[PDB]
Design a protein around this ligand. Structure first.
Ligand SMILES: CC(=O)N[C@H]1[C@H](O[C@H]2C[C@@H](C(=O)NCCS(=O)(=O)O)[NH2+][C@@H]2CO)O[C@H](CO)[C@@H](OS(=O)(=O)O)[C@@H]1O
Ligand SMILES: CC(=O)N[C@@H]1[C@@H](O[C@H](C)C(=O)O)[C@H](O[C@@H]2O[C@H](CO)[C@@H](O)[C@H](O)[C@H]2NC(C)=O)[C@@H](CO)O[C@H]1O
Length: 184
């Protein structure tokens, strides 16, 4: 299946995502996450609409599900429970939480990925469809998965995701990421 069709035109989504850049820069510097990756994710997830709600109830600029990333980010803060839908519609909270989740993905399940480009692809695919789902396409054992990921360059990683990831959305996300980065 051609994960690049239909083509995704990044101009409008990215330009709108850029209007949130003051928040993304601050969030990014706080969590050690690249503001451009944050901007691309905004463009891709919501096209810059802070009230966006997906069919699976992902919410806001960076489309967080309260029950997954919301819960995990709260945990990382030392809090119980999860944010509300309403709370996820607040731009600052949404972006700061998205940035925190990216940090959680990089420092936890994706720790050990050597090539920064491969890591970037792995992050967006984990963000969109879950780290476990990504890692299990390489191995049931996390260290082995990371090891296998480290054997690939960024283009080979994309190819593996396109061939082996059960979610069709996963490789398309990488395609959109590159479209988005260029519109910046
Ligand atoms: C940032 C965030 O909340 N990411 C979560 C992602 O949301 C996705 C789902 C997707 C979505 O809402 N798709 C529906 C698109 S549509 O309505 O059919 O058009 N958008 C969101 C951000 O990428 O779903 C996966 C898998 O459940 C989760 O993986 S998990 O940790 O293993 O549970 C992950 O936490
Ligand atoms: C054809 C296309 O690419 N449309 C974009 C749309 O993608 C969805 C998945 C679609 O094909 O209908 C995109 O919606 C977001 O897509 C990402 C995955 O790429 C999801 O993680 C988000 O949750 C989706 N958002 C919502 C609200 O469901 C939208 C976002 O604005 O733009 C379309 O260009």
């Amino acid at each position: 299946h051609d994960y690049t069709n239909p083509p995704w035109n990044a101009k409008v989504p990215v330009q709108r995502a850029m209007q949130w850049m003051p928040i993304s820069q601050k969030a990014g510097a706080a969590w050690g996450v690249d503001p451009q990756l944050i901007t691309a994710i905004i463009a891709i997830e919501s096209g810059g609409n802070p009230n966006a709600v997906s069919k699976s109830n992902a919410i806001g600029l960076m489309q967080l599900k309260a029950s997954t990333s919301g819960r995990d980010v709260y945990r990382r803060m030392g809090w119980s429970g999860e944010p509300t839908t309403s709370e996820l519609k607040n731009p600052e909270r949404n972006i700061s939480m998205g940035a925190a989740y990216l940090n959680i993905l990089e420092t936890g399940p994706l720790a050990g990925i050597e090539d920064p480009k491969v890591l970037q692809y792995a992050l967006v695919v984990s963000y969109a469809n879950g780290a476990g789902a990504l890692l299990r396409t390489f191995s049931s054992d996390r260290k082995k998965a990371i090891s296998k990921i480290n054997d690939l360059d960024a283009d080979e990683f994309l190819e593996h995701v396109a061939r082996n990831h059960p979610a069709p959305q996963a490789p398309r996300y990488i395609y959109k990421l590159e479209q988005a980065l260029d519109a910046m």
